């Protein structure tokens, strides 16, 4: 069994930017979720080999995780906040697609997502 290559965290052709909102996404939003007790299943790409999930990457064709997001933000990989928010949304959605209600992983995703939504509700302006 094999994992796919992980999502890129750097791309020498992709224009780079740090906006006040992107700074907030790294320093407040990602930081708060990263430290959370439920963060660990989301801190790296799903290892379908190690977790013996041979259908994982049959079902999930746009994988995303907070490790990837963290490195993207550290590398100024994004042009804007919305790209980064989309990646978080994709991570949560994948989890809900692949798993079932009542599964701990789903309960975990939901608590992180509620916190994520709370934090992004107060994105700063480029003030």
């Amino acid at each position: 069994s094999m994992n796919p290559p992980p999502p890129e965290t750097s791309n020498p052709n992709k224009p780079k930017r740090q906006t006040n909102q992107l700074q907030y996404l790294l320093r407040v939003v990602l930081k708060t979720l990263w430290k959370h007790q439920f963060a660990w299943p989301f801190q790296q790409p799903v290892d379908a080999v190690k977790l013996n999930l041979p259908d994982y990457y049959k079902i999930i064709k746009t994988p995303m995780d907070m490790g990837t997001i963290k490195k993207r933000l550290e590398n100024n990989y994004y042009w804007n906040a919305q790209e980064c928010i989309q990646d978080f949304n994709t991570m949560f959605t994948n989890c809900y697609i692949y798993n079932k209600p009542g599964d701990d992983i789903v309960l975990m995703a939901e608590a992180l997502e509620k916190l994520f939504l709370q934090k992004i509700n107060e994105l700063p302006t480029e003030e």
């Binding site: 599964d103 701990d104 992983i105 975990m108």
Partner: peptide, 7 residues
Amino acid sequence: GKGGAKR
């Protein structure tokens, strides 16, 4: 799915 107990 990843049904295992995690919490």
